[PDB]
Amino acid sequence: KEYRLINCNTSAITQACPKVSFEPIPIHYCAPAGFAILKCKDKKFNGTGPCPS
Amino acid sequence: AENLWVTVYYGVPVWKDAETTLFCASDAKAYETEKHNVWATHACVPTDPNPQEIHLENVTEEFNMWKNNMVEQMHTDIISLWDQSLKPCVKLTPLCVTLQCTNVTNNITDDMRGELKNCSFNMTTELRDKKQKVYSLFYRLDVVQINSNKEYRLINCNTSAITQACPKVSFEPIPIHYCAPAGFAILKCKDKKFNGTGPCPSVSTVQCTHGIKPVVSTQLLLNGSLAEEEVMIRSENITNNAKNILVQFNTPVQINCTRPNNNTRKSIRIGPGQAFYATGDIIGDIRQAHCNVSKATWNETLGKVVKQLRKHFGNNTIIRFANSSGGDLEVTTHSFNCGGEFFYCNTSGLFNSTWISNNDSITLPCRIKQIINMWQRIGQAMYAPPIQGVIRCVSNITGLILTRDGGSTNSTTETFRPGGGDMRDNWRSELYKYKVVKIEPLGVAPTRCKRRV
Amino acid sequence: AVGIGAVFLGFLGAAGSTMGAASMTLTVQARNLLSGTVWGIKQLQARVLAVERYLRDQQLLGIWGCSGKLICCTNVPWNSSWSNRNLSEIWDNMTWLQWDKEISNYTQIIYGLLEESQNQQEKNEQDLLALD
Amino acid sequence: DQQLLGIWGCSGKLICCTNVPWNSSWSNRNLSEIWDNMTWLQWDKEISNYTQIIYGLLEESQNQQEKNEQDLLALD
Amino acid sequence: AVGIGAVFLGFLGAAGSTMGAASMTLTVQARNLLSGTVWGIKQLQARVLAVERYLRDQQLLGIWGCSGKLICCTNVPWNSSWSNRNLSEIWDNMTWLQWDKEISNYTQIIYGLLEESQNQQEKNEQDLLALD
Amino acid sequence: DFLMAQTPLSLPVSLGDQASISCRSSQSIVYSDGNTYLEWYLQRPGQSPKLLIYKVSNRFSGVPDRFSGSGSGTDFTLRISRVEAEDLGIYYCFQGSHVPYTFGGGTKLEIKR
Amino acid sequence: QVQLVQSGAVIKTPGSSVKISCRASGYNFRDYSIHWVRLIPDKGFEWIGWIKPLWGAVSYARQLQGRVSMTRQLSQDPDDPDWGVAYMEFSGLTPADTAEYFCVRRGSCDYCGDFPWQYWGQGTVVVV
Amino acid sequence: EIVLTQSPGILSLSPGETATLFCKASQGGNAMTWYQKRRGQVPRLLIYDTSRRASGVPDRFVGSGSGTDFFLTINKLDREDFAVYYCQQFEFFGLGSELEVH
Amino acid sequence: QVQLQQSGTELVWPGTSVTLSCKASGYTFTDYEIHWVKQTPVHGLEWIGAIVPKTGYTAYNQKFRGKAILTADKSSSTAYMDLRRLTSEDSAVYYCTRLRNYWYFDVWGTGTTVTV
Ligand SMILES: *[C@@H]1O[C@H](CO)[C@@H](O[C@@H]2O[C@H](CO)[C@@H](O[C@@H]3O[C@H](CO[C@H]4O[C@H](CO)[C@@H](O)[C@H](O)[C@@H]4O)[C@@H](O)[C@H](O[C@H]4O[C@H](CO)[C@@H](O)[C@H](O)[C@@H]4O[C@H]4O[C@H](CO)[C@@H](O)[C@H](O)[C@@H]4O)[C@@H]3O)[C@H](O)[C@H]2NC(C)=O)[C@H](O)[C@H]1NC(C)=O
Ligand SMILES: *[C@@H]1O[C@H](CO)[C@@H](O[C@@H]2O[C@H](CO)[C@@H](O[C@@H]3O[C@H](CO[C@H]4O[C@H](CO)[C@@H](O)[C@H](O)[C@@H]4O)[C@@H](O)[C@H](O[C@H]4O[C@H](CO)[C@@H](O)[C@H](O)[C@@H]4O)[C@@H]3O)[C@H](O)[C@H]2NC(C)=O)[C@H](O)[C@H]1NC(C)=O
Ligand SMILES: *[C@@H]1O[C@H](CO)[C@@H](O[C@@H]2O[C@H](CO)[C@@H](O[C@@H]3O[C@H](CO)[C@@H](O)[C@H](O[C@H]4O[C@H](CO)[C@@H](O)[C@H](O)[C@@H]4O)[C@@H]3O)[C@H](O)[C@H]2NC(C)=O)[C@H](O)[C@H]1NC(C)=O
Ligand SMILES: *[C@@H]1O[C@H](CO)[C@@H](O[C@@H]2O[C@H](CO)[C@@H](O[C@@H]3O[C@H](CO)[C@@H](O)[C@H](O[C@H]4O[C@H](CO)[C@@H](O)[C@H](O)[C@@H]4O)[C@@H]3O)[C@H](O)[C@H]2NC(C)=O)[C@H](O)[C@H]1NC(C)=O
Ligand SMILES: *[C@@H]1O[C@H](CO)[C@@H](O[C@@H]2O[C@H](CO)[C@@H](O[C@@H]3O[C@H](CO)[C@@H](O)[C@H](O)[C@@H]3O)[C@H](O)[C@H]2NC(C)=O)[C@H](O)[C@H]1NC(C)=O
Ligand SMILES: *[C@@H]1O[C@H](CO)[C@@H](O[C@@H]2O[C@H](CO)[C@@H](O[C@@H]3O[C@H](CO)[C@@H](O)[C@H](O)[C@@H]3O)[C@H](O)[C@H]2NC(C)=O)[C@H](O)[C@H]1NC(C)=O
Ligand SMILES: *[C@@H]1O[C@H](CO)[C@@H](O[C@@H]2O[C@H](CO)[C@@H](O[C@@H]3O[C@H](CO)[C@@H](O)[C@H](O)[C@@H]3O)[C@H](O)[C@H]2NC(C)=O)[C@H](O)[C@H]1NC(C)=O
Ligand SMILES: *[C@@H]1O[C@H](CO)[C@@H](O[C@@H]2O[C@H](CO)[C@@H](O)[C@H](O)[C@H]2NC(C)=O)[C@H](O)[C@H]1NC(C)=O
Ligand SMILES: *[C@@H]1O[C@H](CO)[C@@H](O[C@@H]2O[C@H](CO)[C@@H](O)[C@H](O)[C@H]2NC(C)=O)[C@H](O)[C@H]1NC(C)=O
Ligand SMILES: *[C@@H]1O[C@H](CO)[C@@H](O[C@@H]2O[C@H](CO)[C@@H](O)[C@H](O)[C@H]2NC(C)=O)[C@H](O)[C@H]1NC(C)=O
Ligand SMILES: *[C@@H]1O[C@H](CO)[C@@H](O[C@@H]2O[C@H](CO)[C@@H](O)[C@H](O)[C@H]2NC(C)=O)[C@H](O)[C@H]1NC(C)=O
Ligand SMILES: *[C@@H]1O[C@H](CO)[C@@H](O)[C@H](O)[C@H]1NC(C)=O
Ligand SMILES: *[C@@H]1O[C@H](CO)[C@@H](O)[C@H](O)[C@H]1NC(C)=O
Ligand SMILES: *[C@@H]1O[C@H](CO)[C@@H](O)[C@H](O)[C@H]1NC(C)=O
Ligand SMILES: *[C@@H]1O[C@H](CO)[C@@H](O)[C@H](O)[C@H]1NC(C)=O
Ligand SMILES: *[C@@H]1O[C@H](CO)[C@@H](O)[C@H](O)[C@H]1NC(C)=O
């Protein structure tokens, strides 16, 4: 019986550094000067069309 | 009134000579060709249609193609993008190894030589502990003998590394439009006759240069832009001999070039997720690559250029031609690329004539190398992948690159030899109509008006 | 079929005309002055060099008496030793290129003179609004 | 945008005037209603076709104003 | 052998003088404010930070009444609670550094006051040209 | 400079048949406003050139709808629905986009027997 | 500095072929031309020919063609990109060919042409 | 072709003086180059582009001339200045002028 | 009415100078750009040059550089083409014609033959 890794016929492979984590942190996206970001504050909004709030 | 007052003027149409960078733009049908198989589409911005090119009048401007810039940074940029087209590709460091080579299966002539060798060798596999035995074919011009038995090796493997080109990317040219940033302008000499130095009365500005396809040809510049009516010859100083002579002849002259051999490739896995292509079997007649031109067209175009030369070298002058003297293999010929595969093809059947002060073709044989060192780098080389089928291509021969010999001591024959050397001759045959100028606004002048308070 | 007045009004079209008739267009030159993985670096320093040039010229006008007027006057007379040309001939005879190559030596004198003259004008205007 | 104002008559004023009258074919709205009835968005979507005419008109009008001012200070 | 008036007129030369005599030069400070494989990134963000600063200051003057004048006035009186200094002593006694450290608390009040005052001036000028 | 190769240079054709002239430029002669300013002229032998086609899709005001034009970029095509004896003269493709303006060779319209 | 080390004198028989090396050091060898020139006494100087080592593109003088041969060797390593070796194989020796030979390089200014030969070798005298 | 002719032949003068070598070409329009060769030494460029001096050249060598007639003027002859002098255009050569210590 | 009233048919010598007139008739002279069209039998039609009526701004073909000189009279509303140092190739039919900017040639004059 002799086995091998499945990727080793078709791709290379990289270990992740055990320093780095994979938990999320909150990313705040922002716009540069000259643009603005809008937000629909409506309660019911199926995802298309006008939003008064 | 008589107290003339100085007044400024911002945005005066006026310029000076300057040297700056450029702006690489092509058409969107390069972006129609997808997945970055076209080089110069990562950095090359899409062009615009109908580019502004408006005439300018009562104007005298001195140009020079020889002290011109923008051939320098273009020669920088093309080799730069050439190296940008290799960092995704694959090295061949595990391949330099002892090669058991032998003659290809053919009725062999004992006095002539075949140009294909069957080489078997050890190679790695997907797995480390497994070694394998693989064979391929190579040209004579890429292996050398090391030392009974016979064992060869690649020529670069004592002195340099080696990189396979990715078979995704092509090597056909696409037109590069150079443009200038805001604050500069590009001029263009619209004169018919312009040897390349001095004033040009017929000029016009432009925002972006016209279509320039990048070729690589050590002699016999291919698919280039051609002259209007005459055949023109251009130089820096014709009485100087070591400076070259550019010959832009009017009518294009066709060339056919082919390799008639049917060619099978073979994939070889080097290691984990690696790849390598090699010449497998050759089906059919073992033949030799070549090129052809039309006989009488070549004769008539040489008659035109001999007609144009005799203005410069005395009217009662004998002019003949010779094959090039020697040097590197890729300067003894003209060296081109066809379908993504190179050719070094003998040119002695062309420059062998003489001229007096009063259905056939021309065939010429080629040779095919795989590994190159183009622009003659120091440790950098390039493998070229074998391509399928039977390859031919047709190109319009546009110009010539010549050199007068060092003829002293009472000679009336002034024979010529074709020698390119630098690629910048090929490039300077294209940007000879242009120069770059810097706008400097805020001129100043007296007039008759005083500012009140 | 396109008309010749349009390419007269094109960018750098009036470079060959006399300066008096070339005065009738500056806005096209001014407008085409401004804006209209490794390579974007070169792109980016070219763009910021262009706007650095534009800000230098706007500052040279800003320290002078006129900011957006594009046609100015001042309070320093023209030294006839600079030009000694007739007033009629300069506007209807010469182009801006040869005018530039004539007056090209007399440079950075006139700049400092404009600076000095309108600095004196600033202190005079401050004095007049200080007494009031 | 600063250059588009600079070629126009006003540089830092942020509220300008000029010397071209309003073509009533552009708007045909009452003068009372426009300032107390509409928002800038719907004003923009109304006048959004009539664009690059008014720009060139401002350029032309104040170019003519520049040559008139040059003429008035030249005669003096 | 070089002269002392030149280094008086040099960049930041008048930092030690009184403010009344330091008023006689601003253009050198303004001019030296503007422009005069991995590293060009740092070069480039330094250059664009400098021009971002320059545009911020030009905009702060542009929303104010003066754009290129470099010496301005307005229509808000000086609150004596800010300074309570004599008018004679301030121009011939103090330097700009200690003036800055005195008035450094009273900041962003005067800015908004200039904004408000010339906004009111804009609507007054609009009203005067509207009635005409 | 922006030259015009006019094919054919003489058109012998009977009455009632169509007409097609391919005039090809060196490259794009489009002006910056998007319009390809090519014009087609008719100079009768002994009269002034009356304009057939300006702004290739458009027609001259008075010249009938028998005439038409198409073509873009380089390749340009004057088309006539029926060739008349009033149509006779010399046809012209003409680059009207830049100074210096260039004429084509002209196409002498005549009758083939 | 620019160093142009030739080889010393040598005596050859008539009808033979001589080989003269010229080792250039101190500059980027791939960038400038190399000229050979000669000195026969009571004849003045006579130009021989030139070589560009970038491909070895040569050009010979007319009245000596078929007799002279020029080759070169570059230094291909990433440690010594400077030194290069030019050669000259002169064939068909006559006793009139007794002369002093030089391998020279041009000046490197912007207004420098090609024939104003700035740097000069020490001279190699061959007697037949 | 281009033929060079040097007129003074052998010019014998005393040190400290001035001297003028003269050369004449068949075809006018191009530049002129001057070489110094001392006795048994490696030669040396004096003048390139008919007025420009080489490195280490003191400015007591002044080249001039136009058309076909070209001048090489030396002021204040040092003893080391007494040598053989050549003119070259592109590959051609003058036959050599000898400056001699009188 | 709307007509380019041209000059007369000129029969001249080699090397002389001549002036060809073109009166605008029936319309506003000072706005419609005037062009000149050479007509030889050997070349057909050629572009000579152009003149702006209101400003006098001229631009010439490279062939005609110094060969033709355009002036215009706002008073008599008449374009003038001075033709100097004439050669036999000048034996041609010269057409005066007009356009406005970004439009076509509508009015075509008589066509003046000048034979050298
Ligand atoms: C001077 O200028 C001329 C004018 O351009 C130029 O000639 C042209 O050369 C190029 C390259 O040598 C030719 O391009 C090749 O053309 C063949 C033929 O197909 C075309 O033509 C037919 C009929 O005209 C059309 O119907 C068809 O749609 C094509 O337009 C193609 O087969 C070639 O495509 C292969 O190579 C490309 C390179 O990347 C690939 O992208 C492409 O997908 C094809 O490769 C794939 O298939 C191969 C076969 O299985 C396989 O082995 C590959 O690995 C890959 O999977 C290519 O488009 C062009 O046709 C020539 N022009 C004319 C009119 O013939 C001269 O070359 C130039 N002179 C010099 C010195 O450069
Ligand atoms: C670029 O292209 C040109 C022409 O296309 C090539 O020019 C020819 O090159 C060959 C060799 O490179 C020249 O030499 C010829 O070689 C033949 C082969 O020699 C072998 O066979 C003979 C017996 O047949 C043996 O004696 C010999 O040792 C070899 O084993 C010779 O047969 C030729 O001789 C012929 O001509 C001579 C002279 O006329 C006659 O006396 C003979 O009887 C025989 O007919 C000849 O020696 C050939 O001369 C070149 N052609 C011309 C016109 O000069 C270039 O070589 C090519 N460039 C490169 C780099 O390859
Ligand atoms: C091959 O031919 C080319 C073209 O003829 C030639 O190029 C030119 O060489 C001259 C050398 O004098 C270059 O220098 C210029 O020369 C002009 C005219 O002489 C002048 O404007 C300048 O020199 C003047 O000023 C000097 C300083 O006062 C004077 O000492 C001098 O005598 C002149 O009066 C300027 O330097 C010129 O730039 C090039 N032009 C080009 C396009 O290359 C070349 O030299 C010839 N080859 C060889 C090897 O000579
Ligand atoms: C390059 O060199 C390599 C060297 O390995 C060479 O590969 C070998 O070629 C030989 C001959 O072409 C192959 O031998 C054949 O193998 C096939 C497959 O097993 C057999 O069917 C063949 O048998 C035929 O011929 C016999 C001869 O007596 C008959 O008896 C029989 O009935 C069949 O007709 C024959 O044995 C050998 O297998 C390959 N080896 C490999 C690994 O491919 C290659 O062909 C050379 N290529 C070129 C282009 O020169
Ligand atoms: C590919 O790699 C294999 C594996 O290394 C190479 O085979 C080996 O080659 C050596 C020398 O050619 C052989 O040594 C000799 O073997 C013979 C036969 O036993 C013996 O008589 C000699 O005295 C000597 O020992 C070695 O045995 C051989 N090993 C194997 C497993 O084949 C091979 O040469 C490489 N190249 C090719 C083209 O296959
Ligand atoms: C390439 O062509 C250009 C012109 O398109 C040549 O430029 C000019 O050529 C003329 C004559 O060929 C030179 O005129 C000569 O000038 C000298 C001194 O002014 C005068 O004494 C002569 O009798 C003759 O009239 C002119 O100098 C030259 N201009 C320049 C800037 O060199 C050019 O010479 C041609 N190229 C070569 C290498 O010859
Ligand atoms: C330019 O033309 C000349 C003359 O035709 C070419 O010279 C010839 O070159 C071939 C190739 O070397 C010579 O052939 C002989 O080949 C055998 C092969 O072993 C070799 O032993 C001989 O020493 C010689 O190399 C041929 O003799 C030679 N002819 C002459 C007169 O020298 C030259 O190759 C042509 N240039 C180019 C770039 O092809
Ligand atoms: C080169 O040889 C290959 C050998 O396979 C040829 O490919 C075959 O062509 C025939 C007829 O075109 C087909 O029936 C086969 O299916 C093809 N085989 C493969 C594997 O593709 C190819 O046509 C030859 N090329 C030329 C130009 O002759
Ligand atoms: C260059 O041209 C000459 C003549 O055009 C060729 O000379 C031929 O030489 C052979 C000698 O073996 C003769 O049999 C031929 O008759 C000659 N040709 C002619 C047309 O007379 C010479 O071969 C050419 N060079 C090359 C490399 O082919
Ligand atoms: C090489 O140049 C010739 C120049 O005649 C080209 O031939 C003409 O090309 C244009 C556009 O490419 C066509 O409209 C013409 O019909 C062509 N003429 C003929 C007689 O066919 C040719 O296309 C160019 N390219 C190649 C690959 O030959
Ligand atoms: C690397 O090795 C190769 C082969 O060993 C060398 O190539 C040959 O070298 C010999 C001298 O040893 C020359 O006579 C041949 O002309 C060379 N052939 C080629 C095709 O170049 C090569 O010179 C070596 N390079 C280095 C830098 O050591
Ligand atoms: C192999 O190559 C050599 C040299 O090219 C040749 O002499 C020999 O005939 C070839 N064939 C064999 C079977 O050795
Ligand atoms: C050389 O011939 C041309 C025509 O072929 C002629 O115009 C010219 O005058 C001739 N030159 C000489 C010096 O005879
Ligand atoms: C410009 O000044 C320099 C020296 O200051 C002088 O040599 C030159 O002749 C001057 N140019 C003009 C056109 O007066
Ligand atoms: C704007 O103009 C377009 C065509 O120019 C027209 O179709 C559209 O109705 C116009 N919109 C308004 C609001 O008038
Ligand atoms: C500035 O204000 C702070 C508090 O606002 C105060 O503590 C400080 O003393 C003030 N400085 C001066 C110089 O008045």
CSV table of C-alpha atoms and ligand atoms in Angstrom, one decimal, chain B residues 104-105 118 120 135 137 280-282, ligand 4:
chain,number,residue,atom,x,y,z
B,104,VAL,CA,17.5,10.9,-35.6
B,105,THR,CA,16.0,8.0,-37.6
B,118,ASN,CA,17.3,12.2,-30.2
B,120,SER,CA,17.2,10.5,-23.8
B,135,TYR,CA,13.5,11.4,-24.7
B,137,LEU,CA,14.5,16.0,-30.1
B,280,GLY,CA,8.3,14.5,-29.7
B,281,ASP,CA,7.8,12.7,-33.0
B,282,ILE,CA,8.2,14.1,-36.5
J,4,LIG,C1,14.0,9.0,-30.6
J,4,LIG,O1,14.7,8.0,-29.9
J,4,LIG,C2,13.9,7.2,-29.0
J,4,LIG,C3,14.8,6.3,-28.3
J,4,LIG,O2,14.2,5.7,-27.2
J,4,LIG,C4,12.9,6.4,-29.9
J,4,LIG,O3,12.0,5.7,-29.0
J,4,LIG,C5,11.9,4.3,-29.4
J,4,LIG,O4,11.8,4.1,-30.8
J,4,LIG,C6,11.7,2.7,-31.1
J,4,LIG,C7,11.6,2.7,-32.7
J,4,LIG,O5,10.7,3.7,-33.1
J,4,LIG,C8,10.5,2.1,-30.5
J,4,LIG,O6,10.4,0.7,-30.8
J,4,LIG,C9,9.0,0.4,-31.2
J,4,LIG,O7,8.1,0.3,-30.1
J,4,LIG,C10,6.8,0.1,-30.4
J,4,LIG,C11,5.9,0.2,-29.2
J,4,LIG,O8,6.3,-0.8,-28.3
J,4,LIG,C12,6.6,-1.2,-31.1
J,4,LIG,O9,5.3,-1.4,-31.5
J,4,LIG,C13,7.6,-1.3,-32.3
J,4,LIG,O10,7.5,-2.6,-32.9
J,4,LIG,C14,7.4,-2.5,-34.3
J,4,LIG,O11,8.7,-2.7,-34.9
J,4,LIG,C15,9.3,-3.9,-34.7
J,4,LIG,C16,10.7,-3.9,-35.2
J,4,LIG,O12,11.1,-5.3,-35.3
J,4,LIG,C17,8.4,-5.0,-35.3
J,4,LIG,O13,8.9,-6.3,-35.0
J,4,LIG,C18,6.9,-4.9,-34.7
J,4,LIG,O14,6.1,-5.9,-35.3
J,4,LIG,C19,6.4,-3.5,-34.8
J,4,LIG,O15,6.1,-3.3,-36.2
J,4,LIG,C20,9.0,-1.0,-31.9
J,4,LIG,O16,9.5,-2.0,-31.1
J,4,LIG,C21,10.6,2.3,-28.9
J,4,LIG,O17,9.4,1.8,-28.3
J,4,LIG,C22,10.7,3.8,-28.6
J,4,LIG,N1,10.8,4.0,-27.2
J,4,LIG,C23,10.0,5.0,-26.6
J,4,LIG,C24,10.2,5.1,-25.1
J,4,LIG,O18,9.3,5.7,-27.2
J,4,LIG,C25,12.1,7.4,-30.7
J,4,LIG,O19,11.2,6.7,-31.6
J,4,LIG,C26,13.0,8.4,-31.5
J,4,LIG,N2,12.2,9.4,-32.1
J,4,LIG,C27,12.6,10.1,-33.2
J,4,LIG,C28,11.7,11.1,-33.8
J,4,LIG,O20,13.7,9.8,-33.8
